[PDB]
Design a protein around this ligand. Structure first.
Ligand SMILES: [Cl-]
Ligand SMILES: [Cl-]
Ligand SMILES: [Cl-]
Ligand SMILES: [Cl-]
Ligand SMILES: [Cl-]
Ligand code: NA
Length: 129
């Protein structure tokens, strides 16, 4: 599923991401835009053989099991394919664990390079929330 901007904002708000660990909703929408272009089915392989999955590009090196990342962890206790669903629940719940692990949203390279320090409120401007 390719979300619209305000559609995704509303779904992320319903799932408790607005101001989660102090990160306002626009931060999460901005991260999703540049990680996946709002596409739940996005995948990208990494140099070390791990793969990033879904709207927030969560990495099989640490967070999910895809059966093809030897020596990795599965800290969200899910198959990586669950992060590709049109229902964003699994991605949101895993993202909550990630952002709580000490490094905040710096875990998302695209957030650090394209959202951090910008006017992220623009990503939810005009949306009925
Ligand atoms: Cl957009
Ligand atoms: Cl915001
Ligand atoms: Cl594996
Ligand atoms: Cl949902
Ligand atoms: Cl933080
Ligand atoms: Na894994």
């Amino acid at each position: 599923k390719v979300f619209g901007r305000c559609e995704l904002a509303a779904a992320m708000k319903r799932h408790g991401l607005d101001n989660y660990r102090g990160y306002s909703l626009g931060n999460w929408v901005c991260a999703a835009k540049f990680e996946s272009n709002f596409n739940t089915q996005a995948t990208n392989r990494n140099t070390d053989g791990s793969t990033d999955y879904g709207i927030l590009q969560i990495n099989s090196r640490w967070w999910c099991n895809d059966g093809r990342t030897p020596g990795s962890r599965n800290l969200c206790n899910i198959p990586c394919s669950a992060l590709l669903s049109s229902d964003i629940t699994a991605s949101v719940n895993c993202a909550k664990k990630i952002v709580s692990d000490g490094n905040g949203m710096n875990a998302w390279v695209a957030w650090r390079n394209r959202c951090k320090g910008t006017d992220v409120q623009a990503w939810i401007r005009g949306c009925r929330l």
